[PDB]
């Protein structure tokens, strides 16, 4: 079920049993890596890079075709984002909700959603500090988080 | 969330056996499940089982022979010494003439009779009769 919702959805992705690269794919590992580099310089997060690569260039799995994941490739080249993608998007959502709430004081539904989002932020930050992705003293401040996103 | 894969598999086998199905599919496979099923198959309580191998955790399809009464689990894997194995045995088994207790030992996963035969204790896994 969902972390903060009473939903039990099943919509997922079914990765095929064939890990091999399709024969009709003419892109080589370095070619896909250069495409990822260009998209990352354009500013796309790894999820968007994967979506563009799958939709347009016909590559099924970057890991299958290159042997490495998109974030691993970006970090190896040295242009991975300072914050993780999901944590960044959670902070962005929290900033948007706070900006709405400071004008709509009666939006108690928005206050409840804000509490849920900030709980998710703190749990994810705890995970990242455990994995040493984030600095050990990293803390999400509601006041200063607005300058980190958008 | 699912925290005891063996417990889920054993409950599925028990329910299919009670309903009278000829085959049962248990979705999360593991080495512990395969060893438990191997013990049951060597004692003849189940038929052949085949492992469908996906790149994730595999699935198992077991042929039920219809001669199983219960295949429950002891979820907290208590440490079982040879001095209290008899108390576990007469607490969990229907009689002293049949029924087996599977416990994971240092020598491997095996029933209580073999555990006593080669003189070792271990952690309780489950039972079947």
């Amino acid at each position: 079920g969902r972390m903060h919702a009473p939903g039990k959805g099943l919509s997922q992705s079914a990765l095929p049993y064939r890990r091999s690269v399709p024969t009709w794919l003419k892109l080589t590992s370095d070619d896909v890596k250069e495409q990822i580099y260009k998209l990352a310089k354009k500013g796309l997060t790894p999820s968007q890079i994967g979506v563009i690569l799958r939709d347009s260039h016909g590559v099924a799995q970057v890991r299958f075709v290159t042997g490495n994941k998109i974030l691993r490739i970006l970090k190896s080249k040295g242009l991975a984002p300072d914050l993780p993608e999901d944590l960044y998007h959670l902070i962005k959502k929290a900033v948007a909700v706070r900006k709405h709430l400071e004008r709509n004081r009666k939006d108690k539904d928005a206050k409840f959603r804000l509490i849920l989002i900030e709980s998710r932020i703190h749990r994810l930050a705890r995970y990242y500090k455990t994995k040493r992705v984030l600095p050990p003293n990293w803390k999400y401040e509601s006041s200063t988080a607005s300058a980190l996103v958008a | 969330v699912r925290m005891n894969v063996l417990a889920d598999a054993l409950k599925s086998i028990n329910n299919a056996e009670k309903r009278g199905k000829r085959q049962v599919l248990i979705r999360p496979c593991s080495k512990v499940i395969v060893r438990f099923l191997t013990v049951m198959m060597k004692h003849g309580y189940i038929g052949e089982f085949e492992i469908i191998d996906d790149h994730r955790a595999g699935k198992i399809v077991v042929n039920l022979t219809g001669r199983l009464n219960k295949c429950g689990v002891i979820s907290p894997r208590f440490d079982v010494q040879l001095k209290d194995l008899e108390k576990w045995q007469n607490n969990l088994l229907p009689s002293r003439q049949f029924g087996f207790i599977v416990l994971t030992t240092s020598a491997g996963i095996m029933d209580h009779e073999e555990a006593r035969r080669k003189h070792t204790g271990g952690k309780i896994l489950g039972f079947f009769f």
Binding site: - | S75, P76, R77, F78
Partner: protein
């Protein structure tokens, strides 16, 4: 359900000793206020001085005058009411006697049709009421 983890013994024992206060026997035996309220002070028998001789009406379905004595215990000076349990043993009871009183059967609870009486007289003036009733020995004149 209940917790079953390998290291849940602290919670199990804490919950057990919290819930053990909710039955009347454990509460009575371990709170101490019942012991303080008990006139005997946790003793099987007690001695007292007969303050008075009284009659107690039986309960609603019955109709009788149960013969009791109002007795002040020698220790702690508490005043209780004790049934005199035979046909004519009230005649062997007079004022200022030193009587021995025991429980009346069910641990500080009233018995039968006698309301609010939890004790009965066993001996008077250091001679047994059974002995006096059977005539095996005489009042100490």
């Amino acid at each position: 359900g209940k917790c079953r983890g390998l290291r849940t013994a602290r919670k199990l024992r804490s919950h057990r000793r919290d819930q053990k206060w909710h039955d009347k026997q454990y509460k009575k035996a371990h709170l101490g206020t019942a012991l303080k309220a008990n006139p005997f002070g946790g003793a099987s028998h007690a001695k007292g001085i007969v303050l008075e001789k009284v009659g107690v009406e039986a309960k609603q379905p019955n109709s009788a005058i149960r013969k009791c004595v109002r007795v002040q215990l020698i220790k702690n000076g508490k005043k209780i009411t004790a049934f005199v349990p035979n046909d004519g043993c009230l005649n062997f009871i007079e004022e200022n006697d030193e009587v021995l009183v025991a429980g009346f059967g069910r641990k500080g609870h009233a018995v039968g049709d006698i309301p609010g009486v939890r004790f009965k007289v066993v001996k008077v003036a250091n001679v047994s009421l059974l002995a006096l009733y059977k005539g095996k020995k005489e009042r100490p004149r």
